[PDB]
Design a protein around this ligand. Structure first.
Ligand SMILES: Cc1ccsc1C(=O)O
Ligand SMILES: Cc1ccsc1C(=O)O
Lengths: 235, 179
C-alpha cells in the first residue's frame, strides 16, 4: 500500500474525506451514493493490501528466508499472483475514476457519477472469465491451504518462528495466513451488497441506474458460476 | 491470550453485520453505517481470562452453498442470529441454519441471539407485522427455539442502542473457552 491512497481513504466515509465546504454543496442523496462508492474503493484497497501481504510478506519471505520448496509454498498460497493482477487492475481503474473527478486545486474533493460502466467492464468478457477461473481454482484449494499451514506450524520450528516474527507487528493483527485466505474467499460475495446499495442511491440518472442493474446481474452470474465450479481438494 | 474464532450466521435481514460493526467499534456509527464487515480481532477479558476473538460474517454468502462453508473451518463459537422484528427469520433457524452449522461445526457451542430488541415495542414495526398476521418475537419464543435446537444459551441485544451487545460477545468468549 502507498501513503497517497492510504491518506485518501483514511476517513470512515466520503462525507468525512471531502472538505466540509464541498460536502455542504451536495444533496443528501448524492452524499449517500458517494459514501457507498467510497466504501467499495476503500475495501478494494484493503483487499489488494491483503493480497500484497500474501505475496510479498508471506510467500516471498518463505522462499527467501526459510528456503521452502516452491511446491509447498504454492499449496499455501494458490493463485495469489493471478488474484493480485485482477484486483490491482480493478483498483487502478477505480482510483483513476476518482482522480479524473477531482476538482482543480484539490486532492480530496470529488464526485463519481459514472461507476456502472466500469463495473460492467470488470464483470464481463475476458476479465470476468479470468475472475471465474481464478476464484473457482482458489476456493477449491482453500481447505487444503489451511490444512497445509496447520501441519507446517505444528511440525517445523523454523516455520513457526518465521510466522511469529512476520505477524508480530500491530498492522498484521487481522492478517495471519488463515485470515488472509478467508478474507480473499469472502471478497467476491461482498460485491453484490455494495453494488445493490450504490444502485439504491443512483436513480437520478436513468442510464446510471440501468448500468448498475446490468453490473449487479453480471456479478451474480459470476458468483453462481464460481459456486458451481468448486470442489474441495484433499491431500 | 488464547486465540478463538467466532462466526455469525442467520438470514440476510437478521442484523448480523450491524452487530459485528457496533461491537468492534463500541459505537453505533454516527455518520455512515458500513455495508460490509471484513474481519476483526477483539481483545476480550472474560472472568479473568484474556482472549483474542477473531470475528467473521457470513453476509453475502446465503445463496452460495459451496462458498459459504469455507467460513466454518476451526470455528470455536457460533452466534446464530434472528431479528425480533421478523418472526420469519426465527422460522428459518431450525430447518435451514441449525442442520448446516451442526454438520460443518460439530460440537461447537451455538448462542441463539435475538437482534433488534429495540423494535419489539416500535409502533411502525407492530403496524407493519399485523398486516401479515404477525407480531414481534416474544422473549419466551426465543428461549423455546434455543432450547429446541440445543443452543448453549439464548441472548438478546440491540445494535442501535448497544444494549446487550457486550454481554453477547463476552458470553461467546466463555462458550469458546469450554471443553
Ligand atoms: C494445529 C494448528 C497449527 C497452526 S494453528 C493450529 C490450531 O490448533 O488451530
Ligand atoms: C469447509 C469446511 C467446513 C467446516 S470444516 C471445513 C474444511 O474443509 O476444513
Amino acid at each position: 500500500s502507498m501513503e497517497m491512497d492510504e491518506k485518501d481513504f483514511a476517513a470512515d466515509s466520503w462525507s468525512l474525506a471531502v472538505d466540509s465546504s464541498f460536502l455542504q454543496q451536495h444533496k443528501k442523496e448524492v452524499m449517500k451514493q458517494q459514501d457507498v462508492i467510497y466504501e467499495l474503493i476503500q475495501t478494494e484497497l484493503h483487499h489488494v493490501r491483503t493480497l500484497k501481504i500474501m505475496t510479498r510478506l508471506f510467500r516471498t519471505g518463505m522462499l527467501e528466508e526459510l528456503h521452502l520448496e516452491p511446491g509447498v509454498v504454492q499449496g499455501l498460497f494458490p493463485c495469489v499472483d493471478e488474484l493480485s493482477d485482477i484486483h490491482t487492475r480493478f483498483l487502478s481503474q477505480l482510483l483513476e475514476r476518482r482522480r479524473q473527478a477531482l476538482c482543480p486545486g484539490s486532492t480530496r474533493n470529488f464526485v463519481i457519477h459514472r461507476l456502472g460502466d466500469l463495473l460492467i467492464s470488470q464483470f464481463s468478457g475476458p476479465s470476468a472469465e479470468q475472475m471465474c477461473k481464478t476464484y473457482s481454482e482458489f476456493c477449491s484449494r482453500h481447505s487444503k491451504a489451511l490444512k497445509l499451514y496447520k501441519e507446517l506450524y505444528a511440525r517445523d520450528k523454523r516455520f513457526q518462528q518465521f510466522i511469529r516474527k512476520v505477524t508480530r507487528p500491530a498492522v498484521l493483527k487481522r492478517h495471519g495466513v488463515q485470515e488472509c485466505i478467508l478474507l480473499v474467499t469472502q471478497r467476491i460475495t461482498k460485491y453484490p451488497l455494495l453494488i445493490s446499495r450504490i444502485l439504491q442511491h443512483s436513480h437520478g440518472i436513468e442510464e446510471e441506474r440501468q448500468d448498475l442493474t446490468t453490473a449487479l446481474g453480471l456479478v451474480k452470474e459470476l458468483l453462481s458460476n464460481v459456486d458451481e465450479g468448486i470442489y474441495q481438494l484433499e491431500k | 491470550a488464547i486465540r478463538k474464532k467466532l462466526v455469525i450466521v442467520g438470514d440476510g435481514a437478521c442484523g448480523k453485520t450491524c452487530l459485528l460493526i457496533v461491537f468492534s467499534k463500541d459505537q453505533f456509527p454516527e455518520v455512515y453505517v458500513p455495508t460490509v464487515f471484513e474481519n476483526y480481532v477483539a481483545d476480550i477479558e472474560v472472568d479473568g481470562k484474556q482472549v483474542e476473538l477473531a470475528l467473521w460474517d457470513t453476509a453475502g454468502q446465503e445463496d452460495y452453498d459451496r462458498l459459504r462453508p469455507l467460513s466454518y473451518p476451526d470455528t470455536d463459537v457460533i452466534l446464530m442470529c434472528f431479528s425480533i422484528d421478523s418472526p420469519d427469520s426465527l422460522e428459518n433457524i431450525p430447518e435451514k441454519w441449525t442442520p448446516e452449522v451442526k454438520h460443518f461445526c460439530p460440537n461447537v457451542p451455538i448462542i441463539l441471539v435475538g437482534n433488534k430488541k429495540d423494535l419489539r415495542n416500535d409502533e411502525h414495526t407492530r403496524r407493519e407485522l399485523a398486516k401479515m398476521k404477525q407480531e414481534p418475537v416474544k422473549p419466551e419464543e426465543g428461549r423455546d427455539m434455543a432450547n429446541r435446537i440445543g443452543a448453549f444459551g439464548y441472548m438478546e441485544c440491540s445494535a442501535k442502542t448497544k444494549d446487550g451487545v457486550r454481554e453477547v460477545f463476552e458470553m461467546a468468549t466463555r462458550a469458546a473457552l469450554q471443553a
